Design an enzyme around this catalytic site. Structure first.
Site, PDB file in Angstrom:
ATOM      1  N   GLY A  13       2.124   6.701   8.687  1.00  0.00           N
ATOM      2  CA  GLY A  13       3.495   7.102   8.413  1.00  0.00           C
ATOM      3  C   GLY A  13       4.536   6.069   8.814  1.00  0.00           C
ATOM      4  O   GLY A  13       5.677   6.138   8.365  1.00  0.00           O
ATOM      5  N   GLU A  64      23.749   9.161   6.063  1.00  0.00           N
ATOM      6  CA  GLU A  64      22.746   8.837   5.074  1.00  0.00           C
ATOM      7  C   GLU A  64      23.343   8.281   3.785  1.00  0.00           C
ATOM      8  O   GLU A  64      24.428   8.649   3.353  1.00  0.00           O
ATOM      9  CB  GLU A  64      21.939  10.079   4.688  1.00  0.00           C
ATOM     10  CG  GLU A  64      21.192  10.755   5.803  1.00  0.00           C
ATOM     11  CD  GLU A  64      21.906  11.805   6.596  1.00  0.00           C
ATOM     12  OE1 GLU A  64      23.152  11.956   6.463  1.00  0.00           O
ATOM     13  OE2 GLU A  64      21.207  12.494   7.380  1.00  0.00           O
ATOM     14  N   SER A 106       3.779   2.851   8.112  1.00  0.00           N
ATOM     15  CA  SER A 106       3.466   1.793   7.183  1.00  0.00           C
ATOM     16  C   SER A 106       4.675   1.418   6.362  1.00  0.00           C
ATOM     17  O   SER A 106       5.452   2.261   5.916  1.00  0.00           O
ATOM     18  CB  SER A 106       2.340   2.176   6.251  1.00  0.00           C
ATOM     19  OG  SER A 106       1.120   2.252   6.918  1.00  0.00           O
ATOM     20  N   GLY A 107       4.808   0.109   6.138  1.00  0.00           N
ATOM     21  CA  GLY A 107       5.917  -0.421   5.385  1.00  0.00           C
ATOM     22  C   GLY A 107       7.145  -0.750   6.203  1.00  0.00           C
ATOM     23  O   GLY A 107       8.019  -1.456   5.724  1.00  0.00           O
ATOM     24  N   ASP A 145       1.312   1.682  19.910  1.00  0.00           N
ATOM     25  CA  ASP A 145       1.028   1.097  18.597  1.00  0.00           C
ATOM     26  C   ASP A 145       1.863   1.801  17.539  1.00  0.00           C
ATOM     27  O   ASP A 145       2.450   2.842  17.777  1.00  0.00           O
ATOM     28  CB  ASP A 145      -0.455   1.296  18.286  1.00  0.00           C
ATOM     29  CG  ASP A 145      -1.095   0.487  17.188  1.00  0.00           C
ATOM     30  OD1 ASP A 145      -0.421  -0.415  16.593  1.00  0.00           O
ATOM     31  OD2 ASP A 145      -2.290   0.748  16.919  1.00  0.00           O
ATOM     32  N   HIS A 203       0.814  -1.203   0.000  1.00  0.00           N
ATOM     33  CA  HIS A 203       0.000   0.000   0.000  1.00  0.00           C
ATOM     34  C   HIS A 203       0.855   1.264   0.000  1.00  0.00           C
ATOM     35  O   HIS A 203       0.304   2.360  -0.182  1.00  0.00           O
ATOM     36  CB  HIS A 203      -1.066  -0.017   1.110  1.00  0.00           C
ATOM     37  CG  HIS A 203      -0.636   0.417   2.451  1.00  0.00           C
ATOM     38  ND1 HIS A 203      -0.354  -0.415   3.497  1.00  0.00           N
ATOM     39  CD2 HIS A 203      -0.541   1.681   2.916  1.00  0.00           C
ATOM     40  CE1 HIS A 203      -0.106   0.317   4.573  1.00  0.00           C
ATOM     41  NE2 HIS A 203      -0.197   1.600   4.241  1.00  0.00           N
ATOM     42  N   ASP A 216      -0.028  -7.522   1.791  1.00  0.00           N
ATOM     43  CA  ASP A 216       0.450  -6.134   1.795  1.00  0.00           C
ATOM     44  C   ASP A 216       1.970  -6.105   1.929  1.00  0.00           C
ATOM     45  O   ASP A 216       2.549  -5.806   2.971  1.00  0.00           O
ATOM     46  CB  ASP A 216      -0.227  -5.337   2.922  1.00  0.00           C
ATOM     47  CG  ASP A 216       0.016  -3.846   2.801  1.00  0.00           C
ATOM     48  OD1 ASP A 216       0.513  -3.394   1.748  1.00  0.00           O
ATOM     49  OD2 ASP A 216      -0.329  -3.120   3.786  1.00  0.00           O
ATOM     50  N   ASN A 276      17.338  11.772  11.998  1.00  0.00           N
ATOM     51  CA  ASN A 276      16.487  12.924  11.728  1.00  0.00           C
ATOM     52  C   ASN A 276      16.255  13.025  10.221  1.00  0.00           C
ATOM     53  O   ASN A 276      17.213  13.259   9.471  1.00  0.00           O
ATOM     54  CB  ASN A 276      17.129  14.191  12.284  1.00  0.00           C
ATOM     55  CG  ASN A 276      16.151  15.327  12.274  1.00  0.00           C
ATOM     56  OD1 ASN A 276      15.431  15.552  11.298  1.00  0.00           O
ATOM     57  ND2 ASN A 276      16.071  16.082  13.359  1.00  0.00           N
TER      58      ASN A 276
HETATM   59 CA   LIG Z   1      19.012  12.775   8.085  1.00  0.00          CA
END
Ligand SMILES: [Ca+2]
Length: 223
Positions: A175, A62, A177-178, A171, A40, A84, A54
């Site tokens: 955002g 990164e 999801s996945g 929970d 989805h 899914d 962040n």
């Molecule tokens: Ca960053």
């Protein structure tokens, strides 16, 4: 993630952010070239962001790599969220290191009561809305299939499991999801759906990754 904690930078080294100008879903790095996410979450124009803490600040660890291909499960049904799961291939291989690392696939399914780590950049409020910049984490148990089925009549397939807390307050959420559900070092779940977030008697529902290991392996082997 509602009711969780700040993971700490790069402490979840398999967690990726899917970016299309903005973070929109999580995912899990499973080898230098492939990410597991939720079907989805499919969209064209994905950039995979590895090594993130962040998501709004370049902090030095990164790796940003465009997707070359995405493969939604053959049997994904967007109405029921059965199956899914999707795979995303990276245009170039990630450089693996202590902060950017794959997570193992499971060899057998996990059991109710097993503790797992769920993580993401999703909403941290159950009423209202607040999106974090740094990665959030939640430790939560897998729930019995019977309790899952009773919580969501007519909705839980053999490709889903519930995890979390029936009392509410803790929970995954919009955002997340996945993203990953990791238990004993194995990727057992993908954040999929739920009724609201952190509501009493409405635990999180997760794609049951163990059912898909053969598909994942065969797909990677020919793509
Ligand atoms: Ca960053």
């Amino acid at each position: 993630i509602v009711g969780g904690y700040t993971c700490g930078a790069n402490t979840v080294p398999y967690q990726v952010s899917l970016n299309s100008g903005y973070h929109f879903c999580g995912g899990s790095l499973i080898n230098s070239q492939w990410v597991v996410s939720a079907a989805h979450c499919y969209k064209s124009g994905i950039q995979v962001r590895l090594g993130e803490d962040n998501i709004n600040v370049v902090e030095g660890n990164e790796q940003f790599i465009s997707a070359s291909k995405s493969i939604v499960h053959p049997s994904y049904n967007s109405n029921t969220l059965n199956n899914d799961i999707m795979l995303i291939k990276l245009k170039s291989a990630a450089s693996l290191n202590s902060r950017v690392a794959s997570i193992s696939l499971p060899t057998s399914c996990a059991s109710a009561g097993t503790q797992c780590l769920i993580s993401g950049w999703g909403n941290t409020k159950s009423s209202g809305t607040s999106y974090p910049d740094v990665l959030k984490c939640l430790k939560a148990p897998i729930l019995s299939d019977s309790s899952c089925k009773s919580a969501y009549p007519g909705q839980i397939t053999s490709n889903m499991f519930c995890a979390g807390y029936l009392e509410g307050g803790k929970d995954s959420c919009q955002g997340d999801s996945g993203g990953p559900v990791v238990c004993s070092g194995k990727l057992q779940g993908i954040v999929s759906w739920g009724s609201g977030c952190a509501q009493k008697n409405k635990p999180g529902v997760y794609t049951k990754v163990c059912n898909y290991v053969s598909w994942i392996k065969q797909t990677i082997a020919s793509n």
